[PDB]
């Protein structure tokens, strides 16, 4: 869980 | 979110959007696994609303989103409508979400888990961007 496939960017 | 930025598409795979028979988005939800979403009590979700995942652009037709039906609404019984204290509702899905590169579970913490002040977090959704 909590580790997306597409990494969020900020 | 007032003063936030557009997300990367499918980078928050646990985000759901709750929408009424109308197609109206009125609250956000979170995937804890493939049969159950978590949103707020106040939201006031009924079993006639639809859980939508994989969405990014609410206004796109070409986006392979998943429209999920609600089997059962489970409002916490400690929920305090006058206070908005304990404002957690679970949603049990009648038909299972299909996990993919864009639909995934968020991690739930320990009752024990500490999450200390001045700690940088992130919140998302499809809320007023202007007041």
């Amino acid at each position: 869980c909590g580790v997306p496939a597409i990494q969020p960017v900020l | 979110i007032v003063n936030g930025e557009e997300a990367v598409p499918g980078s928050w795979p646990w985000q759901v959007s709750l929408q009424d028979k109308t197609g109206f988005h009125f609250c956000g939800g979170s995937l804890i696994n493939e049969n159950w979403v978590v949103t707020a009590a106040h939201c006031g979700v009924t079993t006639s609303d639809v859980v939508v995942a994989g969405e990014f652009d609410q206004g796109s037709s070409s986006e392979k989103i998943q429209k999920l039906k609600i089997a059962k609404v489970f409002k916490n019984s400690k929920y305090n409508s006058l206070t908005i204290n304990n404002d957690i509702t679970l949603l049990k899905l009648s038909t299972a979400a299909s996990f993919s590169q864009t639909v995934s579970a968020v991690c739930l913490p320990s009752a024990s888990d500490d999450f200390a002040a001045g700690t940088t977090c992130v919140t998302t959704g499809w809320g007023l961007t202007r007041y």
């Binding site: - | 979110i1 646990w14 969405e55 304990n86 679970l90 913490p109 999450f115 940088t120 977090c121 007023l128």
Partner: protein, 95 residues
């Protein structure tokens, strides 16, 4: 509302410094964040408040309420998943 999904980083605060703002409205199962120049807002509710903990995003709070006006000065107030995961853990066992 916007059509496509938005995101904002914001710092969590103690409830105490939050009471400074929300008073006795702040309850123990509630957790404040922002007043950073970002604001959760109408339509945001039900939604995620995540934090990074040892690789993974953990559900730390649920947009619940705050400013009538969505003020980037008033801290938003979210559900406190820690005080409620016990119940969540439990509905699932059951159904």
């Amino acid at each position: 509302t916007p059509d496509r999904l938005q995101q904002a980083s914001l710092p969590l605060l103690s409830n105490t410094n939050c009471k400074k703002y929300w008073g006795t409205k702040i309850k123990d199962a509630m957790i404040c964040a922002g007043a950073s120049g970002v604001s959760s807002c109408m339509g945001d509710s039900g939604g995620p408040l995540v934090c990074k903990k040892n690789g993974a995003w953990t559900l730390v709070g649920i947009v619940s309420w705050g400013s009538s006006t969505c003020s980037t000065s008033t801290p938003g107030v979210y559900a406190r998943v820690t005080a409620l995961v016990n119940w969540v853990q439990q509905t699932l066992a059951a159904n």
